PDB file of C-alpha atoms (C1' of nucleotides) in Angstrom:
ATOM      1  CA  UNK A   1     -16.014  40.179  -3.926  1.00 44.08           C
ATOM      2  CA  UNK A   2     -18.225  37.525  -2.398  1.00 42.87           C
ATOM      3  CA  UNK A   3     -16.669  34.726  -0.810  1.00 45.02           C
ATOM      4  CA  UNK A   4     -15.689  31.189  -2.379  1.00 44.80           C
ATOM      5  CA  UNK A   5     -16.066  27.670  -0.898  1.00 43.59           C
ATOM      6  CA  UNK A   6     -13.280  26.964   1.876  1.00 43.72           C
ATOM      7  CA  UNK A   7     -12.228  23.664   0.509  1.00 39.47           C
ATOM      8  CA  UNK A   8     -11.759  25.082  -3.161  1.00 40.14           C
ATOM      9  CA  UNK A   9      -9.261  27.592  -1.682  1.00 43.41           C
ATOM     10  CA  UNK A  10      -5.402  26.943  -2.045  1.00 43.66           C
ATOM     11  CA  UNK A  11      -2.974  26.271   1.054  1.00 43.73           C
ATOM     12  CA  UNK A  12      -2.220  29.881   1.092  1.00 43.64           C
ATOM     13  CA  UNK A  13      -5.355  31.725   0.513  1.00 47.64           C
ATOM     14  CA  UNK A  14      -7.267  30.186   3.334  1.00 49.32           C
ATOM     15  CA  UNK A  15      -5.320  31.679   6.361  1.00 49.26           C
ATOM     16  CA  UNK A  16      -6.980  34.842   6.484  1.00 50.01           C
ATOM     17  CA  UNK A  17     -10.190  32.940   7.829  1.00 50.47           C
ATOM     18  CA  UNK A  18      -8.331  30.987  10.519  1.00 48.00           C
ATOM     19  CA  UNK A  19      -5.741  33.601  11.459  1.00 46.69           C
ATOM     20  CA  UNK A  20      -8.368  34.988  14.214  1.00 45.53           C
ATOM     21  CA  UNK A  21      -9.387  31.653  15.714  1.00 46.52           C
ATOM     22  CA  UNK A  22      -6.200  29.437  15.921  1.00 45.56           C
ATOM     23  CA  UNK A  23      -4.661  32.123  18.329  1.00 45.53           C
ATOM     24  CA  UNK A  24      -7.405  31.277  20.610  1.00 44.34           C
ATOM     25  CA  UNK A  25      -7.007  27.645  19.884  1.00 45.28           C
ATOM     26  CA  UNK A  26      -3.497  27.742  21.240  1.00 42.28           C
ATOM     27  CA  UNK A  27      -4.094  29.878  24.300  1.00 41.88           C
ATOM     28  CA  UNK A  28      -6.955  27.515  25.148  1.00 38.28           C
ATOM     29  CA  UNK A  29      -4.827  24.332  24.725  1.00 38.04           C
ATOM     30  CA  UNK A  30      -2.210  25.977  26.598  1.00 37.85           C
ATOM     31  CA  UNK A  31      -4.071  27.197  29.571  1.00 39.09           C
ATOM     32  CA  UNK A  32      -6.402  23.927  29.672  1.00 40.28           C
ATOM     33  CA  UNK A  33      -4.613  21.011  27.846  1.00 42.57           C
ATOM     34  CA  UNK A  34      -1.146  21.631  28.303  1.00 39.39           C
ATOM     35  CA  UNK A  35      -0.036  23.013  24.876  1.00 41.51           C
ATOM     36  CA  UNK A  36      -0.891  20.429  22.345  1.00 43.52           C
ATOM     37  CA  UNK A  37      -2.726  21.651  19.187  1.00 41.37           C
ATOM     38  CA  UNK A  38      -2.702  18.657  16.978  1.00 39.94           C
ATOM     39  CA  UNK A  39      -4.559  16.298  19.528  1.00 40.17           C
ATOM     40  CA  UNK A  40      -6.946  19.021  20.527  1.00 40.03           C
ATOM     41  CA  UNK A  41      -7.834  19.627  17.071  1.00 36.72           C
ATOM     42  CA  UNK A  42      -8.332  16.023  16.427  1.00 36.05           C
ATOM     43  CA  UNK A  43     -10.664  15.488  19.303  1.00 35.03           C
ATOM     44  CA  UNK A  44     -12.790  18.319  18.047  1.00 35.59           C
ATOM     45  CA  UNK A  45     -12.783  16.940  14.549  1.00 34.93           C
ATOM     46  CA  UNK A  46     -13.846  13.626  15.859  1.00 34.46           C
ATOM     47  CA  UNK A  47     -16.546  15.329  17.813  1.00 37.83           C
ATOM     48  CA  UNK A  48     -17.736  16.959  14.680  1.00 35.91           C
ATOM     49  CA  UNK A  49     -17.665  13.846  12.576  1.00 33.35           C
ATOM     50  CA  UNK A  50     -19.571  11.957  15.274  1.00 30.87           C
ATOM     51  CA  UNK A  51     -22.177  14.398  15.904  1.00 30.38           C
ATOM     52  CA  UNK A  52     -22.765  14.554  12.047  1.00 28.50           C
ATOM     53  CA  UNK A  53     -23.067  10.537  12.053  1.00 27.67           C
ATOM     54  CA  UNK A  54     -20.065   9.692   9.922  1.00 29.28           C
ATOM     55  CA  UNK A  55     -18.679   7.027  12.063  1.00 32.43           C
ATOM     56  CA  UNK A  56     -17.036   5.458   9.193  1.00 35.23           C
ATOM     57  CA  UNK A  57     -14.826   8.337   8.255  1.00 37.03           C
ATOM     58  CA  UNK A  58     -14.243   8.821  11.979  1.00 37.25           C
ATOM     59  CA  UNK A  59     -12.949   5.060  12.212  1.00 39.09           C
ATOM     60  CA  UNK A  60     -10.837   5.783   9.054  1.00 39.92           C
ATOM     61  CA  UNK A  61      -9.087   8.956  10.794  1.00 38.32           C
ATOM     62  CA  UNK A  62      -8.780   7.055  13.855  1.00 39.24           C
ATOM     63  CA  UNK A  63      -6.814   4.288  12.006  1.00 37.65           C
ATOM     64  CA  UNK A  64      -4.834   6.870   9.960  1.00 35.85           C
ATOM     65  CA  UNK A  65      -3.681   8.546  13.310  1.00 34.78           C
ATOM     66  CA  UNK A  66      -3.013   5.124  14.912  1.00 34.00           C
ATOM     67  CA  UNK A  67      -1.211   2.340  13.523  1.00 32.96           C
ATOM     68  CA  UNK A  68      -2.168   1.376  10.061  1.00 33.34           C
ATOM     69  CA  UNK A  69      -4.571  -1.677   9.509  1.00 32.04           C
ATOM     70  CA  UNK A  70      -3.774  -2.144   5.890  1.00 31.73           C
ATOM     71  CA  UNK A  71      -2.908  -5.579   4.634  1.00 32.69           C
ATOM     72  CA  UNK A  72      -4.550  -9.045   5.736  1.00 31.90           C
ATOM     73  CA  UNK A  73      -2.583 -12.203   6.823  1.00 30.48           C
ATOM     74  CA  UNK A  74      -2.215 -14.769   4.265  1.00 31.57           C
ATOM     75  CA  UNK A  75      -4.026 -17.457   6.272  1.00 32.37           C
ATOM     76  CA  UNK A  76      -7.343 -14.936   6.510  1.00 29.55           C
ATOM     77  CA  UNK A  77      -6.926 -14.356   2.665  1.00 25.94           C
ATOM     78  CA  UNK A  78      -6.932 -18.027   1.988  1.00 27.12           C
ATOM     79  CA  UNK A  79      -9.732 -18.643   4.178  1.00 27.70           C
ATOM     80  CA  UNK A  80     -11.868 -15.939   2.278  1.00 31.45           C
ATOM     81  CA  UNK A  81     -10.961 -17.278  -0.910  1.00 34.69           C
ATOM     82  CA  UNK A  82     -11.598 -20.691   0.016  1.00 33.44           C
ATOM     83  CA  UNK A  83     -14.896 -20.281   1.910  1.00 34.99           C
ATOM     84  CA  UNK A  84     -16.549 -17.827  -0.306  1.00 33.94           C
ATOM     85  CA  UNK A  85     -16.395 -20.433  -2.918  1.00 33.13           C
ATOM     86  CA  UNK A  86     -14.056 -18.206  -4.995  1.00 37.71           C
ATOM     87  CA  UNK A  87     -11.816 -19.313  -7.641  1.00 36.53           C
ATOM     88  CA  UNK A  88      -8.151 -18.259  -8.596  1.00 37.63           C
ATOM     89  CA  UNK A  89      -9.114 -16.119 -11.686  1.00 36.45           C
ATOM     90  CA  UNK A  90     -11.742 -14.225 -10.001  1.00 37.62           C
TER      91      UNK A  90
ATOM     92  CA  UNK B   1      -2.644  30.319  47.746  1.00 37.10           C
ATOM     93  CA  UNK B   2      -3.653  26.925  48.856  1.00 36.96           C
ATOM     94  CA  UNK B   3      -3.993  23.712  46.908  1.00 33.98           C
ATOM     95  CA  UNK B   4      -7.579  22.490  46.642  1.00 30.48           C
ATOM     96  CA  UNK B   5      -6.903  19.351  45.045  1.00 32.66           C
ATOM     97  CA  UNK B   6      -8.779  17.570  42.281  1.00 31.46           C
ATOM     98  CA  UNK B   7      -8.576  14.917  39.725  1.00 28.22           C
ATOM     99  CA  UNK B   8      -5.339  15.246  37.550  1.00 29.10           C
ATOM    100  CA  UNK B   9      -5.545  16.484  34.313  1.00 28.35           C
ATOM    101  CA  UNK B  10      -4.695  13.484  32.094  1.00 30.74           C
ATOM    102  CA  UNK B  11      -3.811  13.713  28.296  1.00 30.12           C
ATOM    103  CA  UNK B  12      -6.811  14.838  26.096  1.00 28.40           C
ATOM    104  CA  UNK B  13      -6.307  11.575  23.993  1.00 31.56           C
ATOM    105  CA  UNK B  14      -6.421   9.526  26.993  1.00 30.46           C
ATOM    106  CA  UNK B  15     -10.024  10.379  28.091  1.00 34.23           C
ATOM    107  CA  UNK B  16     -13.497   9.368  26.829  1.00 35.85           C
TER     108      UNK B  16
ATOM    109  C1'  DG C   1     -13.076  54.126  -8.228  1.00 39.11           C
ATOM    110  C1'  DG C   2     -14.726  50.896  -3.533  1.00 39.06           C
ATOM    111  C1'  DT C   3     -14.660  46.585  -1.544  1.00 39.65           C
ATOM    112  C1'  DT C   4     -13.486  42.181  -0.433  1.00 39.20           C
ATOM    113  C1'  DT C   5     -11.134  38.137  -2.102  1.00 44.74           C
ATOM    114  C1'  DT C   6      -6.930  35.675  -3.952  1.00 46.14           C
ATOM    115  C1'  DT C   7      -2.598  35.118  -4.110  1.00 44.24           C
ATOM    116  C1'  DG C   8       2.357  36.578  -4.509  1.00 46.63           C
ATOM    117  C1'  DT C   9       6.655  37.977  -1.969  1.00 48.25           C
ATOM    118  C1'  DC C  10      10.098  38.854   1.826  1.00 45.17           C
ATOM    119  C1'  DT C  11      15.223  35.971   4.905  1.00 45.24           C
ATOM    120  C1'  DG C  12      16.843  32.990   8.595  1.00 47.40           C
ATOM    121  C1'  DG C  13      15.709  28.964  10.570  1.00 48.62           C
ATOM    122  C1'  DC C  14      13.198  24.403  11.475  1.00 47.04           C
ATOM    123  C1'  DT C  15      11.851  19.488   9.941  1.00 45.99           C
ATOM    124  C1'  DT C  16      10.835  16.047   6.339  1.00 44.61           C
ATOM    125  C1'  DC C  17      11.502  13.509   2.230  1.00 43.53           C
ATOM    126  C1'  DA C  18      14.454  11.812  -1.931  1.00 44.02           C
ATOM    127  C1'  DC C  19      18.822  10.187  -3.637  1.00 45.39           C
ATOM    128  C1'  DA C  20      24.041   9.248  -4.533  1.00 48.90           C
ATOM    129  C1'  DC C  21      26.348   4.881  -5.427  1.00 52.14           C
ATOM    130  C1'  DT C  22      26.686  -0.595  -5.350  1.00 54.86           C
ATOM    131  C1'  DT C  23      25.233  -6.235  -4.754  1.00 54.87           C
ATOM    132  C1'  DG C  24      22.466  -9.277  -4.084  1.00 55.21           C
ATOM    133  C1'  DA C  25      17.569 -10.852  -1.953  1.00 54.31           C
ATOM    134  C1'  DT C  26      13.435 -11.310  -2.417  1.00 56.45           C
ATOM    135  C1'  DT C  27       8.357 -10.258  -4.098  1.00 53.94           C
ATOM    136  C1'  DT C  28       4.785  -9.087  -8.097  1.00 55.11           C
ATOM    137  C1'  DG C  29       3.440  -9.504 -12.965  1.00 52.40           C
ATOM    138  C1'  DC C  30       2.043 -12.083 -16.793  1.00 52.48           C
ATOM    139  C1'  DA C  31       2.349 -15.299 -20.622  1.00 51.66           C
ATOM    140  C1'  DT C  32       1.702 -21.132 -21.365  1.00 56.00           C
ATOM    141  C1'  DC C  33      -0.640 -25.509 -21.336  1.00 55.59           C
ATOM    142  C1'  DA C  34      -4.441 -28.257 -22.907  1.00 55.40           C
ATOM    143  C1'  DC C  35      -9.287 -28.139 -21.767  1.00 56.83           C
ATOM    144  C1'  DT C  36     -14.947 -26.987 -19.957  1.00 57.51           C
ATOM    145  C1'  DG C  37     -19.611 -25.112 -20.958  1.00 58.62           C
ATOM    146  C1'  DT C  38     -23.973 -22.880 -23.360  1.00 59.22           C
ATOM    147  C1'  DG C  39     -25.582 -24.678 -27.930  1.00 58.55           C
TER     148       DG C  39
ATOM    149  C1'  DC D   1     -33.990 -34.437  13.402  1.00 56.24           C
ATOM    150  C1'  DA D   2     -29.056 -31.962   6.788  1.00 58.87           C
ATOM    151  C1'  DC D   3     -27.146 -28.024   6.723  1.00 60.87           C
ATOM    152  C1'  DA D   4     -24.998 -24.188   4.397  1.00 60.04           C
ATOM    153  C1'  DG D   5     -27.030 -21.086   1.432  1.00 62.22           C
ATOM    154  C1'  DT D   6     -30.803 -17.192  -1.164  1.00 61.74           C
ATOM    155  C1'  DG D   7     -32.207 -12.315  -1.234  1.00 65.55           C
ATOM    156  C1'  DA D   8     -35.863  -8.746  -0.003  1.00 63.25           C
ATOM    157  C1'  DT D   9     -38.004  -6.926   4.051  1.00 63.63           C
ATOM    158  C1'  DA D  10     -38.845  -4.967   8.729  1.00 61.42           C
ATOM    159  C1'  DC D  11     -37.543  -4.268  13.482  1.00 61.65           C
ATOM    160  C1'  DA D  12     -33.979  -3.849  17.050  1.00 60.79           C
ATOM    161  C1'  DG D  13     -29.656  -1.687  18.582  1.00 63.22           C
ATOM    162  C1'  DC D  14     -26.476   1.821  19.085  1.00 61.63           C
ATOM    163  C1'  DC D  15     -24.972   6.634  18.686  1.00 59.69           C
ATOM    164  C1'  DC D  16     -25.436  12.206  18.007  1.00 59.32           C
ATOM    165  C1'  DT D  17     -28.244  17.122  19.690  1.00 61.71           C
ATOM    166  C1'  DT D  18     -30.378  19.934  23.675  1.00 63.30           C
ATOM    167  C1'  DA D  19     -29.315  20.786  29.758  1.00 65.05           C
ATOM    168  C1'  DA D  20     -29.313  19.975  34.111  1.00 66.78           C
ATOM    169  C1'  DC D  21     -28.585  16.532  37.369  1.00 66.10           C
ATOM    170  C1'  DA D  22     -26.492  12.395  39.676  1.00 65.92           C
ATOM    171  C1'  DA D  23     -22.884   8.355  41.136  1.00 64.45           C
ATOM    172  C1'  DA D  24     -18.055   7.990  41.643  1.00 63.76           C
ATOM    173  C1'  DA D  25     -12.433   8.202  41.436  1.00 64.57           C
ATOM    174  C1'  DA D  26      -7.859  11.351  42.904  1.00 66.12           C
ATOM    175  C1'  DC D  27      -5.428  14.607  45.589  1.00 64.91           C
ATOM    176  C1'  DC D  28      -5.139  18.704  49.716  1.00 65.10           C
ATOM    177  C1'  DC D  29      -5.052  19.779  54.192  1.00 67.51           C
ATOM    178  C1'  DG D  30      -7.296  20.532  58.974  1.00 66.68           C
TER     179       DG D  30
ATOM    180  C1'  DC E   1     -13.020 -17.406 -36.811  1.00 65.21           C
ATOM    181  C1'  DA E   2     -16.924 -17.242 -28.826  1.00 63.84           C
ATOM    182  C1'  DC E   3     -15.228 -16.045 -24.971  1.00 66.06           C
ATOM    183  C1'  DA E   4     -14.488 -16.286 -20.171  1.00 64.57           C
ATOM    184  C1'  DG E   5     -12.467 -18.961 -17.363  1.00 66.05           C
ATOM    185  C1'  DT E   6      -9.168 -23.293 -14.872  1.00 66.13           C
ATOM    186  C1'  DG E   7      -5.204 -23.422 -11.659  1.00 66.35           C
ATOM    187  C1'  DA E   8       0.154 -24.731 -11.548  1.00 63.96           C
ATOM    188  C1'  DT E   9       4.649 -23.336 -13.383  1.00 68.00           C
ATOM    189  C1'  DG E  10       8.217 -20.816 -14.547  1.00 66.06           C
ATOM    190  C1'  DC E  11      11.100 -16.497 -15.952  1.00 64.98           C
ATOM    191  C1'  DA E  12      11.276 -10.976 -16.725  1.00 65.91           C
ATOM    192  C1'  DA E  13      10.754  -7.219 -14.128  1.00 64.51           C
ATOM    193  C1'  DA E  14       9.917  -4.149  -9.877  1.00 64.29           C
ATOM    194  C1'  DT E  15      11.069  -3.446  -4.998  1.00 62.46           C
ATOM    195  C1'  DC E  16      14.190  -3.249  -1.490  1.00 63.29           C
ATOM    196  C1'  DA E  17      17.540  -3.685   2.632  1.00 63.59           C
ATOM    197  C1'  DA E  18      22.367  -2.050   4.066  1.00 66.89           C
ATOM    198  C1'  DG E  19      25.745   2.469   5.059  1.00 68.82           C
ATOM    199  C1'  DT E  20      26.023   8.292   5.758  1.00 68.36           C
ATOM    200  C1'  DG E  21      26.379  12.582   3.879  1.00 68.40           C
ATOM    201  C1'  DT E  22      24.282  15.677   0.954  1.00 67.92           C
ATOM    202  C1'  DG E  23      20.176  18.128  -2.147  1.00 65.73           C
ATOM    203  C1'  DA E  24      15.243  19.462  -2.608  1.00 65.95           C
ATOM    204  C1'  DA E  25      11.047  20.786  -0.735  1.00 68.84           C
ATOM    205  C1'  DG E  26       7.495  22.419   2.725  1.00 70.13           C
ATOM    206  C1'  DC E  27       6.541  25.359   6.261  1.00 70.45           C
ATOM    207  C1'  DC E  28       7.025  28.877  10.509  1.00 72.17           C
ATOM    208  C1'  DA E  29       7.478  33.668  11.796  1.00 71.85           C
ATOM    209  C1'  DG E  30       4.748  38.298  11.086  1.00 73.31           C
ATOM    210  C1'  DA E  31       4.192  42.102   7.418  1.00 74.20           C
ATOM    211  C1'  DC E  32       3.979  44.442   2.585  1.00 71.53           C
ATOM    212  C1'  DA E  33       2.157  44.261  -2.009  1.00 70.63           C
ATOM    213  C1'  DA E  34      -0.175  43.325  -6.485  1.00 71.83           C
ATOM    214  C1'  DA E  35      -4.581  40.802  -9.934  1.00 72.36           C
ATOM    215  C1'  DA E  36      -9.719  40.240 -10.008  1.00 70.03           C
ATOM    216  C1'  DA E  37     -15.005  39.852  -9.685  1.00 71.18           C
ATOM    217  C1'  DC E  38     -19.397  42.377  -8.133  1.00 68.82           C
ATOM    218  C1'  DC E  39     -21.251  47.253  -7.153  1.00 67.99           C
TER     219       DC E  39
ATOM    220  C1'  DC F   1      -9.674   9.906  58.696  1.00 66.92           C
ATOM    221  C1'  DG F   2     -12.647  12.668  56.058  1.00 65.29           C
ATOM    222  C1'  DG F   3     -15.114  17.161  54.022  1.00 62.17           C
ATOM    223  C1'  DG F   4     -13.678  19.908  50.060  1.00 62.93           C
ATOM    224  C1'  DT F   5     -12.464  20.633  45.199  1.00 60.58           C
ATOM    225  C1'  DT F   6     -11.640  19.156  40.414  1.00 59.62           C
ATOM    226  C1'  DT F   7     -12.680  15.833  37.016  1.00 60.27           C
ATOM    227  C1'  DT F   8     -14.711  11.422  34.896  1.00 62.03           C
ATOM    228  C1'  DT F   9     -18.747   9.075  33.557  1.00 59.93           C
ATOM    229  C1'  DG F  10     -23.438   8.205  33.325  1.00 59.89           C
ATOM    230  C1'  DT F  11     -28.426   9.501  33.315  1.00 59.14           C
ATOM    231  C1'  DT F  12     -33.117  11.333  31.874  1.00 58.77           C
ATOM    232  C1'  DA F  13     -36.380  11.778  27.176  1.00 59.19           C
ATOM    233  C1'  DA F  14     -38.033  13.117  22.037  1.00 62.92           C
ATOM    234  C1'  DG F  15     -36.129  12.465  17.633  1.00 65.53           C
ATOM    235  C1'  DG F  16     -32.637  10.966  13.165  1.00 67.87           C
ATOM    236  C1'  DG F  17     -29.652   7.816  10.838  1.00 66.01           C
ATOM    237  C1'  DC F  18     -26.414   3.839   9.851  1.00 66.06           C
ATOM    238  C1'  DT F  19     -25.671  -1.041  10.852  1.00 61.57           C
ATOM    239  C1'  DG F  20     -26.862  -5.729  12.158  1.00 62.56           C
ATOM    240  C1'  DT F  21     -29.917  -9.818  12.547  1.00 63.81           C
ATOM    241  C1'  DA F  22     -34.243 -12.480  12.379  1.00 64.27           C
ATOM    242  C1'  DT F  23     -37.949 -14.464   9.071  1.00 65.72           C
ATOM    243  C1'  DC F  24     -40.183 -16.351   4.687  1.00 65.65           C
ATOM    244  C1'  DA F  25     -40.915 -20.450   1.721  1.00 66.96           C
ATOM    245  C1'  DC F  26     -37.519 -23.111  -1.021  1.00 69.13           C
ATOM    246  C1'  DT F  27     -32.487 -25.455  -3.248  1.00 69.89           C
ATOM    247  C1'  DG F  28     -29.261 -29.465  -3.682  1.00 68.33           C
ATOM    248  C1'  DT F  29     -26.357 -33.852  -3.188  1.00 66.07           C
ATOM    249  C1'  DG F  30     -28.482 -37.817  -2.767  1.00 65.50           C
TER     250       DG F  30
END
DNA sequence: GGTTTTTGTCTGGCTTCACACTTGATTTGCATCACTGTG
DNA sequence: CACAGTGATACAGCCCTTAACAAAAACCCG
DNA sequence: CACAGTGATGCAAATCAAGTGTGAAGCCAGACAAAAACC
DNA sequence: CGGGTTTTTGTTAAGGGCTGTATCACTGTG
């Protein structure tokens, strides 16, 4: 049977395509980086993203991994609402 | 074996 | 029928999130109020 | 020399690919 | 029976902070085992 | 004390693509 799209696969039915490769992922990380896998995959995915010119999603991933930037200060919210000539209902 | 020195291997998240 | 893909399971053991109660203590939501403005 | 808009357009700037080379910082040991 | 604002006020409702011991879920191991779409 | 080794960081140029900013004749309270 012909293959399907990688993203449409379930959480379990997509291991037979990464089984051959994640083993060299760990051995490379062990012999060069020290043993970290999440970090060495994160840097690889950042490489792919910024090569693909998707810096917006790259920065979003960086924010998710680091401290979340969600939430504005009340002072800056008021500054926006006032200096953009906005009304309370809008 | 003899140690040849070199720059220490910093954590991969702390490089450029 | 072959071939490849797609899901299913196995038990011991690990982490990770939700909850069981209760009493306040906030924080968010939405309706009220008499009015404008284009005629 | 009023000063903050008003929106469309065009140009500059910055960041990825190839691959080999070059300036520079951190230990090791004679 | 025009309809979208206009902002302050006030009360109903949602979320939570405190305490620890649970349940419930996701996943790791490597391996064995059934459905299903093209020849 | 300084080569030697390992690693970091930048550089060279032809292209592609996203983002940022200057420029144009005008407004409006008078």
